């Protein structure tokens, strides 16, 4: 597609996020569980490290874990299996 630079909450674009998943509900749970793993990493980094890993892309200065999760989905670094 062709557009201007998406700014703020609409980056990465949703029509390019939705090629990864089946439907928007699967996208919601995909990004939410990845954000939970990232927040557990950030509260477990001083102590010993469990299986929670990430961020797989380099975050900004003060970037929310949901934004990092959506950029990870768009950059094609995760994989998911439905119920």
């Amino acid at each position: 597609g062709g557009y201007d630079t998406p700014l703020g909450i609409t980056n990465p674009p949703i029509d390019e996020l939705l090629d990864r998943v089946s439907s928007k509900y699967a996208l919601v749970i995909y990004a939410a569980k990845r954000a939970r793993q990232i927040n557990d990493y950030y509260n477990q980094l001083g102590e010993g490290i469990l299986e929670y890993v990430g961020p797989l892309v380099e975050p900004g200065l003060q970037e929310k874990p949901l934004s990092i999760a959506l950029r990870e989905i768009h950059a094609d670094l995760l994989e998911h299996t439905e119920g």
Partner: protein
């Protein structure tokens, strides 16, 4: 009997669900709102709520 009693005629619905010893299965979309669990529609169904998310093999290795 829980979605029916909250609609209309609360006294009449409760007074003959009690006689029949009726059992609710909480399969509805208004019974789950009352008892405070996930509605069975949208992102609250088992196809979407049990998604397992993990990093892939080549990006686990490359970090």
């Amino acid at each position: 009997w829980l979605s029916a009693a909250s609609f209309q005629e609360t006294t009449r619905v409760l007074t003959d669900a009690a006689i029949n010893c009726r059992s609710d299965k909480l399969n509805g979309l208004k019974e789950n709102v009352i008892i405070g669990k996930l509605i069975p529609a949208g992102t609250g169904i088992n196809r979407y709520r049990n998604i397992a998310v993990q990093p892939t093999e080549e990006a686990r290795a490359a970090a």
